[PDB]
mmCIF file of C-alpha atoms and ligand atoms in Angstrom:
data_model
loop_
_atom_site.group_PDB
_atom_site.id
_atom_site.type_symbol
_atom_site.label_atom_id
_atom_site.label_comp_id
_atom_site.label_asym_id
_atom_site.label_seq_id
_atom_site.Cartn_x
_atom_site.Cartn_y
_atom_site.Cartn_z
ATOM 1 C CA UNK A 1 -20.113 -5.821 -9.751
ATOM 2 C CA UNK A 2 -17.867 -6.722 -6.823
ATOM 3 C CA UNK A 3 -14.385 -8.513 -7.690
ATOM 4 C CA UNK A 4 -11.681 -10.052 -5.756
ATOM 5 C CA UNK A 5 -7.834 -9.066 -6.649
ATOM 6 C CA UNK A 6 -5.747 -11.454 -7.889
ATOM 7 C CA UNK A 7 -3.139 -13.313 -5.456
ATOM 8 C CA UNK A 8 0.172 -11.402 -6.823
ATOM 9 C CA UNK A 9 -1.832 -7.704 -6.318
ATOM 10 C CA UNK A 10 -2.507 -9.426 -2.685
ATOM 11 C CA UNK A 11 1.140 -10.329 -2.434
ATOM 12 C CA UNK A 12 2.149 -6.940 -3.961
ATOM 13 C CA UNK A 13 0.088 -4.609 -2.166
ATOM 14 C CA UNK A 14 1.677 -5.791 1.494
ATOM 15 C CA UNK A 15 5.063 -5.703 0.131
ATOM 16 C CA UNK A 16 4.709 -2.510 -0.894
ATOM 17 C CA UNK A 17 2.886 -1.629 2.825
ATOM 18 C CA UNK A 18 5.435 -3.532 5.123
ATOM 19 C CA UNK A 19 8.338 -2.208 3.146
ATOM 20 C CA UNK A 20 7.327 1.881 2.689
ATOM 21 C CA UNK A 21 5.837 1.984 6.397
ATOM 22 C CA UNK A 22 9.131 4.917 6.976
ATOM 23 C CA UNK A 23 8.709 6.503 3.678
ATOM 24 C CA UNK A 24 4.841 7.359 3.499
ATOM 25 C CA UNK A 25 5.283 10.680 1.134
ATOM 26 C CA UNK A 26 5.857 8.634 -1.802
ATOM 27 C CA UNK A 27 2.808 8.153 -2.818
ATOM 28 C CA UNK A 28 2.453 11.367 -3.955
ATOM 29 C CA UNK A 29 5.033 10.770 -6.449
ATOM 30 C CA UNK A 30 3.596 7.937 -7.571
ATOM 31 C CA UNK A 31 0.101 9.489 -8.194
ATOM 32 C CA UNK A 32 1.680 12.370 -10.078
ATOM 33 C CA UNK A 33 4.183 10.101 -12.406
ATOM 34 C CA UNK A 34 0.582 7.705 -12.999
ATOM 35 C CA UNK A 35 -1.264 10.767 -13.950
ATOM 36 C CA UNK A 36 1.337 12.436 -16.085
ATOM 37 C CA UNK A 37 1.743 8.738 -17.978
ATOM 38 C CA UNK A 38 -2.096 8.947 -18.641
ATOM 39 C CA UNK A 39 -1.958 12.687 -19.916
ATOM 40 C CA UNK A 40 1.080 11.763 -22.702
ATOM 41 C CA UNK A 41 -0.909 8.625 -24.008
ATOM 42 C CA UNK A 42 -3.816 11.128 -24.719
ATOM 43 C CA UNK A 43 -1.285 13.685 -26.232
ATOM 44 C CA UNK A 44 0.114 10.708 -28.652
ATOM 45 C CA UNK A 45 -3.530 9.882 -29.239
ATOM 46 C CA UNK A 46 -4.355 12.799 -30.092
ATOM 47 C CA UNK A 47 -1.443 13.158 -33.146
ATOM 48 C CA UNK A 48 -3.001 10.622 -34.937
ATOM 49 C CA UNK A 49 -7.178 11.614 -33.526
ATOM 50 C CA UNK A 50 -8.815 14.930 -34.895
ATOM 51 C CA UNK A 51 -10.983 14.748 -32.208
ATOM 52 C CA UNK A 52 -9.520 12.939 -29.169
ATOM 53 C CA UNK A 53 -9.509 15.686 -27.018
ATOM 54 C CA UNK A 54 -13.614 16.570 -27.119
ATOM 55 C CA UNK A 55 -14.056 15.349 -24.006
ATOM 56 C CA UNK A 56 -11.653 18.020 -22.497
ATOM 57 C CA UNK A 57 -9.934 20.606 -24.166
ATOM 58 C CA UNK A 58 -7.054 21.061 -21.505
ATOM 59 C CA UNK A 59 -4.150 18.340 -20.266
ATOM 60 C CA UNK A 60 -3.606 18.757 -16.812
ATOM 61 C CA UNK A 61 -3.550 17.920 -13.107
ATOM 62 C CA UNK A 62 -5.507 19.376 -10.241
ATOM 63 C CA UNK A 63 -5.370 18.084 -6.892
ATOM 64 C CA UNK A 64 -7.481 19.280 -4.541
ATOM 65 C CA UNK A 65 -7.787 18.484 -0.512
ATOM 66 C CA UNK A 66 -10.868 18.259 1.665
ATOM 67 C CA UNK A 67 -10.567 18.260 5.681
ATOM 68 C CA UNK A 68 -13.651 18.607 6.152
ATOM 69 C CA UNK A 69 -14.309 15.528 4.728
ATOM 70 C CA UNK A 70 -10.989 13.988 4.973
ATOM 71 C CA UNK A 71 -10.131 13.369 1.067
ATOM 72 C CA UNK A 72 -7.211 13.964 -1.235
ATOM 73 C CA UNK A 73 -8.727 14.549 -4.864
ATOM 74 C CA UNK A 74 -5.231 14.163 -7.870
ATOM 75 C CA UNK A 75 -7.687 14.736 -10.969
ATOM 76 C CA UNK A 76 -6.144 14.363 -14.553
ATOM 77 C CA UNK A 77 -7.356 15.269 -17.935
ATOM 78 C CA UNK A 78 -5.517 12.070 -19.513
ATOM 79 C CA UNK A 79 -6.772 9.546 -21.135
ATOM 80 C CA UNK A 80 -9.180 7.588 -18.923
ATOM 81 C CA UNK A 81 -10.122 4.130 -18.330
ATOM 82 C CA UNK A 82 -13.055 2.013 -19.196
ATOM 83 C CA UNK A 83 -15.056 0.041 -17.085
ATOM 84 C CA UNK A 84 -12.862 -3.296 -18.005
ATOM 85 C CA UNK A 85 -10.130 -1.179 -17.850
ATOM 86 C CA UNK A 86 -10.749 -0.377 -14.740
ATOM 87 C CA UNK A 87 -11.138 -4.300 -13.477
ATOM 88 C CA UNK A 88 -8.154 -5.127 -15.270
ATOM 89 C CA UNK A 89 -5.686 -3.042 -14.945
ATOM 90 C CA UNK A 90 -6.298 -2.212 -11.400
ATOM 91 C CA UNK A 91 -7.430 -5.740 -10.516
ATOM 92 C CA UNK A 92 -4.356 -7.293 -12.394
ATOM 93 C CA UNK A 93 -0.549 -6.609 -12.339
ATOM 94 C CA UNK A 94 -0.024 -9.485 -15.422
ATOM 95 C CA UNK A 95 1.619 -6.391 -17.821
ATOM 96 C CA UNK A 96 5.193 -8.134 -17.763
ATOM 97 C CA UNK A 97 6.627 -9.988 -14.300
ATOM 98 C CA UNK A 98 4.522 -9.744 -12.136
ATOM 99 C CA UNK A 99 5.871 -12.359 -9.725
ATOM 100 C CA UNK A 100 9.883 -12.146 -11.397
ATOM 101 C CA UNK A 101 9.170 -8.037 -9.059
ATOM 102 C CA UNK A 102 8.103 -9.770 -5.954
ATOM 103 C CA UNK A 103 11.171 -11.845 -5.593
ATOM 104 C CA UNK A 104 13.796 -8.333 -5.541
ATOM 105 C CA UNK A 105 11.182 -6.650 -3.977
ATOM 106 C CA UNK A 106 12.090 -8.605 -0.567
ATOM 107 C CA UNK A 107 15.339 -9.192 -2.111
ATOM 108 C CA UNK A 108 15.331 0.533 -0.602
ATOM 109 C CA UNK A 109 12.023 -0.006 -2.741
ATOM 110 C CA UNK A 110 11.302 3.055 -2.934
ATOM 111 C CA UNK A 111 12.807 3.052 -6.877
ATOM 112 C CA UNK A 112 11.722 -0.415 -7.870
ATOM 113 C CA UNK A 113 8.128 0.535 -7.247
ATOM 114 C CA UNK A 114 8.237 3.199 -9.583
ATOM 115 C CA UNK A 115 10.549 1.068 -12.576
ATOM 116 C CA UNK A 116 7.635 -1.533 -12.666
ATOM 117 C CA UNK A 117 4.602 1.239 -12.397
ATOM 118 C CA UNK A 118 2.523 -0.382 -9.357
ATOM 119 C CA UNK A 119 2.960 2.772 -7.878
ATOM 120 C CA UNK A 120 -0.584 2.979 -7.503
ATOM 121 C CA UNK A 121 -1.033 0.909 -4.958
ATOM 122 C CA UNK A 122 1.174 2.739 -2.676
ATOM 123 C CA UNK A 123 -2.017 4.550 -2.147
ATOM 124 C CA UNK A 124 -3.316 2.473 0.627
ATOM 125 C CA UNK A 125 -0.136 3.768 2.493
ATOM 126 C CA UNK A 126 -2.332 6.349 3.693
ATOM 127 C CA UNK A 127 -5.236 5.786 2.448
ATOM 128 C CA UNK A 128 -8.231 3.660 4.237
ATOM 129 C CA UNK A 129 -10.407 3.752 0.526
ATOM 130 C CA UNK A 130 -9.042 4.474 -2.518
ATOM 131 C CA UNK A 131 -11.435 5.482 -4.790
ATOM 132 C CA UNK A 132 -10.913 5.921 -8.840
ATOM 133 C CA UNK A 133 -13.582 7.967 -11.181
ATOM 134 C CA UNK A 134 -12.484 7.724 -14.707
ATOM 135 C CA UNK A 135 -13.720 8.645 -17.734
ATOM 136 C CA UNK A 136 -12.530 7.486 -21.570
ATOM 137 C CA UNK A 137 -13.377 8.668 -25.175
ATOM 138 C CA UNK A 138 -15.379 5.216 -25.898
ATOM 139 C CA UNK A 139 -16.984 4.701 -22.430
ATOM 140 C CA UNK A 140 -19.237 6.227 -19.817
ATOM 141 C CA UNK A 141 -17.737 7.483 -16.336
ATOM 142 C CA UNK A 142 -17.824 4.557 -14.132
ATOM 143 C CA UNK A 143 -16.411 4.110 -10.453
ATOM 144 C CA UNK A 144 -13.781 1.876 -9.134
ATOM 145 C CA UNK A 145 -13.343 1.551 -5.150
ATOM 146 C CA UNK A 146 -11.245 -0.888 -2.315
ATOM 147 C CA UNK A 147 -10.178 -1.162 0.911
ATOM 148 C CA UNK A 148 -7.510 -3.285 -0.594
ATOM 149 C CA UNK A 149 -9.936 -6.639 0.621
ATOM 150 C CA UNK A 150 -12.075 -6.382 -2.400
ATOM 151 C CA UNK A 151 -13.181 -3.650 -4.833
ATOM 152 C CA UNK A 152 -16.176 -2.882 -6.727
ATOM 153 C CA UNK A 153 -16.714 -0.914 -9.886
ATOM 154 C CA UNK A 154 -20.093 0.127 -11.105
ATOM 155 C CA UNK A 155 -21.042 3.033 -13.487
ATOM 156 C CA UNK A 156 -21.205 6.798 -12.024
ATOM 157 C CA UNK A 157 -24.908 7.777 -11.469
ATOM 158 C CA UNK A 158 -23.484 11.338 -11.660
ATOM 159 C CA UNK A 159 -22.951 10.523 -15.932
ATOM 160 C CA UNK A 160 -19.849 12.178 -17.314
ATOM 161 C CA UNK A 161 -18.399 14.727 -14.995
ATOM 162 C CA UNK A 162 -14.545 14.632 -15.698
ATOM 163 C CA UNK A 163 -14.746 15.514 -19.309
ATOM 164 C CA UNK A 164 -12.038 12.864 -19.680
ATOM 165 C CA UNK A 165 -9.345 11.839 -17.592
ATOM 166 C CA UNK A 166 -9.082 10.313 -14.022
ATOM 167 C CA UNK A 167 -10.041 11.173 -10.369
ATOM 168 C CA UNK A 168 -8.258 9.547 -7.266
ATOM 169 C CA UNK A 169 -9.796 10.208 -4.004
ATOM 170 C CA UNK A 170 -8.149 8.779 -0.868
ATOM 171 C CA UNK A 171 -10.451 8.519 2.102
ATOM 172 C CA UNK A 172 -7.179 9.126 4.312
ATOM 173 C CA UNK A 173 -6.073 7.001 7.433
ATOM 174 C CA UNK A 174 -6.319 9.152 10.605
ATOM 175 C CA UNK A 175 -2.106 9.196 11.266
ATOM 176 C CA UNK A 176 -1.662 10.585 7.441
ATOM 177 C CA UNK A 177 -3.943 14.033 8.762
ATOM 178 C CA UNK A 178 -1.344 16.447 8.134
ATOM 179 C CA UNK A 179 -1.890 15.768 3.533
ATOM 180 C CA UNK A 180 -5.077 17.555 4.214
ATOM 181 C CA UNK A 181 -3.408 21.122 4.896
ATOM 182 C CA UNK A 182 -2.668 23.212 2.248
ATOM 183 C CA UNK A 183 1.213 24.357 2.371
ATOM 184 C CA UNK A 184 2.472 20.257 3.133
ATOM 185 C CA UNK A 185 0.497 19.358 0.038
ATOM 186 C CA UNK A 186 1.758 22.087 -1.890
ATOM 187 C CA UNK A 187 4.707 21.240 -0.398
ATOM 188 C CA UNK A 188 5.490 17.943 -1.557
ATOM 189 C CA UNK A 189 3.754 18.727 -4.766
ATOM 190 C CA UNK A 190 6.831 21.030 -5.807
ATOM 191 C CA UNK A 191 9.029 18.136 -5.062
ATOM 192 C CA UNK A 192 7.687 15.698 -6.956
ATOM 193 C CA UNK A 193 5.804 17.927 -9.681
ATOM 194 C CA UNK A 194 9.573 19.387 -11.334
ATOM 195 C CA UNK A 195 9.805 17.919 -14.400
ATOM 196 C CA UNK A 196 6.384 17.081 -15.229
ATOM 197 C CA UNK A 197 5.557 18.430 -18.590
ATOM 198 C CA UNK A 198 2.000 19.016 -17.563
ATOM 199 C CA UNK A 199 0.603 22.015 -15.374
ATOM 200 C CA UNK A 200 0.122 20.991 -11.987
ATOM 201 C CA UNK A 201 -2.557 22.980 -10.016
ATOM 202 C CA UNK A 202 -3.695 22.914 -6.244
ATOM 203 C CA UNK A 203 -6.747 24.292 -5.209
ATOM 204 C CA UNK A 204 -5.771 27.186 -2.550
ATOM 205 C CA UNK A 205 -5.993 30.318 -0.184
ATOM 206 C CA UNK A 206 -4.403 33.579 -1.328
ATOM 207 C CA UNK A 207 -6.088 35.799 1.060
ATOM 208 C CA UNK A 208 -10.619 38.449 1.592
ATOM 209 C CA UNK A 209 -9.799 34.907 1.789
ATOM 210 C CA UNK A 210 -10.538 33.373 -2.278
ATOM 211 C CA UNK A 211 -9.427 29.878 -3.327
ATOM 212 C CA UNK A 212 -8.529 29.642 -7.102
ATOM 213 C CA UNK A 213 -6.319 27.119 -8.632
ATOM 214 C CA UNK A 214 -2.811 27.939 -8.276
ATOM 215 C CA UNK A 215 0.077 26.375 -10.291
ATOM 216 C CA UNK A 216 3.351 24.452 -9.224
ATOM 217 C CA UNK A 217 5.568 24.403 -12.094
HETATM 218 C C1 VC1 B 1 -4.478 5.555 -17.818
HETATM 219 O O1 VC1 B 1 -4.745 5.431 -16.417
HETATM 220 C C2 VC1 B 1 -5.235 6.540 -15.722
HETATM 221 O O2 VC1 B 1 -6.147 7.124 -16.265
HETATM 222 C C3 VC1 B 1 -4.635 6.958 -14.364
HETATM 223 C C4 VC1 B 1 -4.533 8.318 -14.001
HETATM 224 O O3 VC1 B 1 -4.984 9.243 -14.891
HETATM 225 C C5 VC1 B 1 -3.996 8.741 -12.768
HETATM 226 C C6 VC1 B 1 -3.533 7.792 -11.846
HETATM 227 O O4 VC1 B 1 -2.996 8.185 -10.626
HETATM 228 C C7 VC1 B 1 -3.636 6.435 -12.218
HETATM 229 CL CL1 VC1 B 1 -3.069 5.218 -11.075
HETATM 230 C C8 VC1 B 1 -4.180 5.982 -13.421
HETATM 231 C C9 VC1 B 1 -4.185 4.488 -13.652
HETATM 232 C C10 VC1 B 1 -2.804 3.907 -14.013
HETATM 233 C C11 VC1 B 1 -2.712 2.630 -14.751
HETATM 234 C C12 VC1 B 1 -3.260 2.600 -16.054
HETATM 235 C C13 VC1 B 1 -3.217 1.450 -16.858
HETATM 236 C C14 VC1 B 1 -2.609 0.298 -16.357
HETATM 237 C C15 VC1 B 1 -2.058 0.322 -15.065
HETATM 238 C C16 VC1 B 1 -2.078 1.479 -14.234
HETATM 239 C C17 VC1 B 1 -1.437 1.407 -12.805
HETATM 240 C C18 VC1 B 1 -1.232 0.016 -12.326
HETATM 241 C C19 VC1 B 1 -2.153 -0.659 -11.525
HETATM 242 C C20 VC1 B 1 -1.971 -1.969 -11.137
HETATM 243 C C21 VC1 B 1 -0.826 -2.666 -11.571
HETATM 244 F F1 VC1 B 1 -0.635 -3.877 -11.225
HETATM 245 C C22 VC1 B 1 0.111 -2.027 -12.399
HETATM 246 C C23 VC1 B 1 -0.125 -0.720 -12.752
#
């Protein structure tokens, strides 16, 4: 139930810390490129699927703060993870490199990240848990959560509650406090959100004061 990450995600994870310290936004970049890459491989799926897209009807991405609580929600209807999905790819970086990256890594990073798709773990940039609910067509919603020491994943006692796709929640570091205010979230979710092919929503105020989901592209 509890698993230890392999040496290169170790390795990886403070070279990405120690080297993005000055550039702390990207993250958001990286969680909305990861997210749109899971909603095409359900879209190519679902070419060849008559009925890959029960789970949910729609393909997109709604993030959603949380001050009072301190979390950063970046929910997608893609096409989810299973539970040994979940321990390997997030527990693993073996896909192609892997160590050949960490050489011109410590050899700007804030492209190279992105070219080799670890952007995930950019998240503990600001980020004190990461947590990751995910749901796939041939699994049951399970839970994946670290500190970046260890992580656990373990099935959702909730059941299925995304439908399909993935949820990342950040527990946010105290210093990152101003991504919990609408307007800098929307803010940085224009920049990064401008030629995703997906709609891009972020639960907000249009004052009366009502809270719908509002779209950024
Ligand atoms: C399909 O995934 C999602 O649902 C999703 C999603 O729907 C939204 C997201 O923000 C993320 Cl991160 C995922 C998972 C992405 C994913 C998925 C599969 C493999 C790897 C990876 C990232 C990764 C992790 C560790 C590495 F060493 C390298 C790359």
């Amino acid at each position: 139930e509890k698993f230890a990450f392999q040496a290169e995600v170790n390795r990886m994870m403070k070279l990405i810390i120690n080297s993005l310290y000055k550039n702390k936004e990207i993250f958001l970049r990286e969680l909305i490129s990861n997210a749109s890459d899971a909603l095409d491989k359900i879209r190519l799926i679902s070419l060849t699927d008559e009925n890959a897209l029960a789970g949910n009807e729609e393909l997109t991405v709604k993030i959603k703060c949380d001050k009072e609580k301190n979390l950063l929600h970046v929910t997608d209807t893609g096409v989810g993870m299973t539970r040994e999905e979940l321990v390997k790819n997030l527990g693993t970086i073996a896909k192609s490199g892997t160590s050949e990256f960490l050489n011109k890594m410590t050899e700007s990073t804030s492209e190279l990240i992105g070219q080799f798709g670890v952007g995930f773990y950019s998240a503990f940039l600001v980020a004190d848990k990461v947590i990751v609910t995910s749901k796939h067509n041939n699994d049951t919603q399970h839970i994946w959560e670290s500190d970046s020491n260890e992580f656990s994943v373990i099935a959702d006692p909730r059941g299925n509650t995304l439908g399909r796709g993935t949820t990342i929640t950040l527990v946010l570091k105290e210093e990152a406090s101003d991504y919990l205010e609408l307007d800098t979230i929307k803010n940085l979710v224009k920049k990064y959100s401008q030629f995703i092919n997906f709609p891009i929503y972020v639960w907000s105020s249009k004052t009366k004061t009502v809270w719908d989901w509002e779209l950024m592209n």
